[PDB]
Design a binder for this molecule. Structure first.
Ligand SMILES: COc1ccc(NC(=O)Nc2ccncc2)cc1
Ligand SMILES: COc1ccc(NC(=O)Nc2ccncc2)cc1
Ligand SMILES: [Cl-]
Ligand SMILES: [Cl-]
Lengths: 695, 697
């Protein structure tokens, strides 16, 4: 059920032993020694990774190393579509702008921070949540010359439990992290967008990197003289596999949760955030789909835009299903009522006052938040010409010296990026007419961005005429219209440009709404400090984990499937057979790699198939994960690596507010399938030989 | 494979059925010289199965079986299709015009009699052995002089089985006064609607209730206000013990057709011609129809039934092709015929190998013609609406060329034009479908094989399909209402003879009939060779583990209540519940609306004695019985012969089961009798029907 602090391992160890954990407490996490914790990394700032060899080899997801694989891909060597397997350490590709962070030490600094905070004076100060203030405190505690006295190391203080607990992390950062291996996109992204958030899942979501360091193992940026890192701890790979009900645990960096939402915050998330995103993206995607299906050239241009929009749309559908069917609102209401009744018993009314403050703030910002989500989903991300060029003050005070030619070249560059190879003005006019029609019916005249008032005033409610006029008269309506402007550019032309005025007034309204809504965050944040303090004083730390905040956490559970609906059961494990069932040569998502199809036909599974001769692919567990847990190591009862976390099912997206024991599962790629792909697809035996594989 | 057995075969299967869990005595299920459960089974309205469930002639069948009767009695004032119907007294039960129930009174083996009569073989290639006219003459000769007059209600019929190797005579008793008694609302009777068709898990309460009426003596009589309910020889008891995984289950009913003795070449033909053409052509048609329905809500209203009708056989073809591709149907037919050829070589009788060769050679010879026939039938005859536009008759044409018969000819033509261009017909949507359908057709069918008018696409329109279709509507008398009225005011036969839509419809129907006539001769050599082929299979492996193809005659099938795994890591259990109906509820989707009386029954958990041991309310279950079309409404029996459900569908993974039964995929989709009794009781409030039935604890 939780995403636990490392400090909480002691308090949970007894329950973990009852659930099947066999390894000693300090072999997993030791606060003043080496443990398994020392093989877990924050990969490229938002993913998890793990060290799997004495020479710094690292495993993470394919979608985590995707940008590094794409940056090294050319028409001649397409590593993204064909995979990449460096046959020697010297062939491993360096990557610019990459990092791996180890959590060297973690210390509770709550009393220190709470004492420093007593010197504030303003009771409404938000310094208790300020990264700048907490960094000043971290520097004061670690020392002035800390990064110079301890190279590669840095410190950081984070707030937990709404400002009721503080931890200082000593981090070791390596920036020479090289690409070692990756499966083809047919394996790494098999389900592609169709199978995203889906269980059963048949995706071999992995990529391999290697940490490089100086001669002493200290962090150093890319240098041709860098040598692989010999780490203090690395994971052993298990080949025993998994069985139903087996104990499993994960370590990683879950990003965000909202476990202490009030019932009113759940209502707001459903009725404003989710409903607006669902309604607006459904209109947008609907128009985009008709156009993509009618013109194959539009399908090529709008496919990535369509897929990007669908991702958070599917998350919202999954979240709204949980609110509707799993009683998320009711359970938050029961949580806050239990605290209010206990606070009445103790004679302390501050907890009931805190819930009231949150409720009143949510109620007060409802119309503004609705207007913000309406313009953001509807126009800012809904209409492409909302992001068309707007002349800067420097560019206008140049058009009215030959700095006029400098202004037109900068504006031209931005116009070229807006109307690129993937931009269709005809498809954009069709999307805008549908998106604006919905927007104009939901936002009243007195609340509209200034230019949108012209629909009623100048165009007599004709949205198609308003959009047609924007393109017909704008200098950014076509290439010819822009070149005519660039030949005779006047600031008067730009000041009255219908597309410039549209983009300007929709962005003005978007910023005005953002600025008006920002003040409402602080009273809720301050009230949550009191609210969570009461919940902890009443029920304690065990069941009540702190919200995820991109810090190292552990979660445990079992390898177990679930029933998604009446009379249907999804087991705990998928197989290579399931990849072959899904094979569609004419669907780019479900194409199967010929070397992999051959392994399946010949049963060339070696030491990786199960006791029944079936080749596993993925498995699912009752662990509690969220975004940031991509690439997380999955451990046995003995701490040996059995898989990598890569997703969670859609029925569990509401798990960021309330864990769903009967639906929520972590989708993990089996480590036996990872080794099968490295071995029989990549032929990279040197990586298998480098790992410590246990029978 | 796991058969649809003749009643004659119950004797030689009985020990296997008992070993599998059957507890009832053989002759209590079927006895040729006396009353048995077989007497409570009926052929309902010519194509469904039904069952008598009371001593007063009450009959259960599917909702989709009694759907036309429910619709005919529905008005704006009393919409029985939408709200349901529950006659609170026998006098309130509604009569139905053109309805029948057929009982199979006696079944007799007449093989020797027919084979002896056939020896008067004036021609060895005679198809009289399969002729309904010839076999009826033989049935009449055997039954006697004016049998129907001497036994009012009774009739006799002989059918061929095993490709002409076995013949049975059936004595049928037909009742035509069959009244509507009860029906659930459509939100229960057709819950999944088109989305859940051929789908398991299934949550549909597919049932309707009728009652057989007869004269004072229980003899068949047409509708009369003096008719009285029938007291039957036998009726089913209703069980409330329910089902458990692996429980024995059996069905009796009238499966219509199977192709269990197809050669491997016939399976290839079915896949590559029949199914691939239907799949490709309906996919183009449905694709255009969908874009238009999604763009104009008025087009969605007009084309919804046409879209759904086209999808039904399209889904069946996808399911059938999946089985051919993944379950080795072709290979198993090849193994069957190779086994026979090897055995025939050992016996020194080459006629079986010669029979399979005849079938193969015939299939190979008709390939181009059959491809052209399916291409025009799926592509144009069914694919394009203006293919069925009016064609002036020889008499209508003659009338327009010196009497008042001219105005009668125009009124007849107008009537047909009005039926073609009806409230649901869109010329714009039809031009869009035709342009896509004809483009694919012109791509597949060469110039020298095209219907005469379609040659104009290349010759007159320079390959512009859109121009050809645009011209048909622009110049045709049936292109618009105004174009028709202009014709009707000044009608000339010259105008009709050169009309582009008339010429299109005429030449596509000419080519369709030419292809049909050229292909008909190829049926007879295959049929004659199948008589020799099945004779060998029966002589080699016996009339024991290979059942005769379904032919709309009474059969029994047995198996177990069991689910299946459709794909890797997914299991579908054997039983659905009321909870599953509630999960699927969508108030804005007409298919998944949930009746308020049913929703409250669930919330209140008002399940009476109908819920299972765990307190869950059962809805449907699935079994390894072998069913096909015609089995809709079939009674599902316990190990004791008590009614536990009504068959109403089969999953798509089992549609290939008409050629080869699929033990690990094929399942009959049955509505639980406890759910039927819950709907009658708590949704209809019709206690008199529950009191009338013999319900066992
Ligand atoms: C909204 O109008 C509609 C009218 C009819 C249908 N269903 C239908 O025709 N189903 C069908 C099932 C099996 N065989 C043939 C046809 C659906 C929607
Ligand atoms: C097109 O190629 C293939 C088609 C089917 C399979 N798998 C298979 O037999 N199905 C199966 C059903 C249920 N559970 C596990 C497996 C493999 C390849
Ligand atoms: Cl280290
Ligand atoms: Cl099977």
């Amino acid at each position: 059920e939780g995403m636990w602090l490392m400090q909480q391992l002691g308090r949970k160890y007894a329950q973990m032993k009852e659930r099947g954990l066999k390894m000693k407490e300090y072999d997993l996490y030791n606060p003043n020694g080496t443990s398994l914790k020392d093989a877990v990394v924050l990969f490229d700032g938002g993913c998890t990774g793990e060290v799997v060899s004495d020479r710094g080899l690292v495993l993470t997801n394919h979608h985590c190393g995707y940008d590094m694989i794409q940056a090294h891909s050319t028409l001649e060597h397409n590593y993204l579509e064909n995979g990449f397997w460096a046959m020697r350490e010297a062939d491993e590709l360096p990557n610019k702008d990459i990092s791996v962070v180890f959590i060297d030490k973690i210390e509770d600094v709550t009393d220190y921070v709470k004492k420093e905070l007593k010197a504030i004076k303003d009771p409404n100060s938000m310094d208790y949540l300020s990264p700048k203030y907490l960094q000043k405190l971290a520097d004061k505690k670690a020392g002035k010359n800390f990064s110079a006295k301890n190279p590669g190391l840095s410190v950081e203080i984070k707030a937990f439990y709404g400002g009721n607990l503080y931890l200082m992390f000593t981090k070791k950062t390596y920036t020479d992290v090289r690409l070692v291996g990756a499966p083809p996109s047919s394996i790494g992204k098999f389900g592609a967008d169709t199978d995203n958030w889906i269980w059963p899942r048949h995706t071999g979501d992995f990529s391999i990197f290697r940490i490089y360091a100086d001669k002493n193992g200290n962090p150093a940026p890319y240098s041709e003289d860098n040598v692989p890192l010999k780490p203090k701890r690395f994971f052993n790979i298990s080949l025993g596999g998994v069985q139903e009900n087996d104990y499993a645990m994960i370590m990683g960096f879950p990003g965000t949760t909202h476990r202490y939402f009030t019932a009113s915050e759940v209502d707001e998330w459903k009725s404003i955030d989710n409903d607006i995103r669902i309604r607006m993206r459904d209109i947008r995607q609907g128009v985009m789909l008709r156009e993509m299906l009618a013109d194959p050239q539009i399908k090529i241009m709008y496919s990535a835009k369509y897929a990007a929009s669908q991702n958070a749309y599917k998350r919202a559908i999954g979240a709204n299903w949980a609110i509707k069917t799993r009683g998320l609102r009711q359970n938050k209401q029961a949580m806050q009522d239990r605290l209010i009744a206990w606070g009445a018993k103790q004679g302390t009314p501050r907890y009931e006052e805190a819930v009231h403050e949150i409720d009143a703030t949510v109620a007060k910002r409802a119309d503004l938040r609705r207007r913000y989500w309406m313009i953001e989903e509807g126009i800012i991300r809904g209409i492409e010409f909302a992001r068309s060029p707007i002349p800067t003050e420097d560019e206008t005070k140049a058009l009215q010296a030959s700095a006029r030619k400098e202004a037109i070249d900068k504006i031209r560059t931005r116009y070229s990026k807006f109307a690129n190879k993937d931009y269709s003005a005809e498809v954009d006019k069709k999307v805008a007419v549908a998106m604006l029609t919905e927007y104009l019916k939901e936002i009243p005249y007195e609340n509209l961005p200034l230019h949108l008032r012209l629909v009623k005033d100048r165009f007599a409610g004709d949205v198609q005429a308003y959009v047609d006029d924007i393109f017909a008269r704008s200098v950014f309506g076509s290439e010819a219209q822009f070149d005519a402007f660039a030949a005779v550019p006047s600031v008067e032309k730009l000041a009255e440009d219908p597309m410039v005025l549209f983009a300007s007034s929709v962005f003005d309204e978007y910023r005005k709404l953002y600025n008006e809504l920002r003040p409402y965050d602080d009273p809720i944040l301050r009230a949550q400090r009191t609210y969570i303090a009461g919940l902890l004083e009443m029920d304690g730390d065990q069941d009540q984990f702190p919200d995820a905040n991109l810090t190292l956490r552990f979660t445990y559970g079992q390898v177990k499937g679930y029933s998604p609906r009446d009379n249907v059961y999804y087991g705990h494990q998928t197989t290579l057979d399931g990849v072959m069932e899904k094979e569609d040569p004419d669907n780019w998502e479900f194409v199967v790699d010929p070397k992999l199809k051959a392994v399946y036909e010949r049963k060339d599974f070696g030491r990786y198939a199960d006791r029944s001769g079936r080749m596993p692919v993925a498995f699912c567990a009752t662990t509690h994960t969220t975004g940031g847990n991509s690439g997380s190591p999955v451990m046995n009862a003995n701490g040996e690596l059995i898989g990598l976390n890569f997703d969670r099912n859609w029925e569990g997206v509401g798990g960021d507010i309330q864990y769903l024991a009967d639906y929520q599962r972590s989708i993990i790629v089996d480590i036996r399938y990872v080794l099968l792909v490295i071995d029989k697809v990549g032929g990279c035996q040197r990586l298998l030989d480098e790992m410590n594989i246990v029978p």
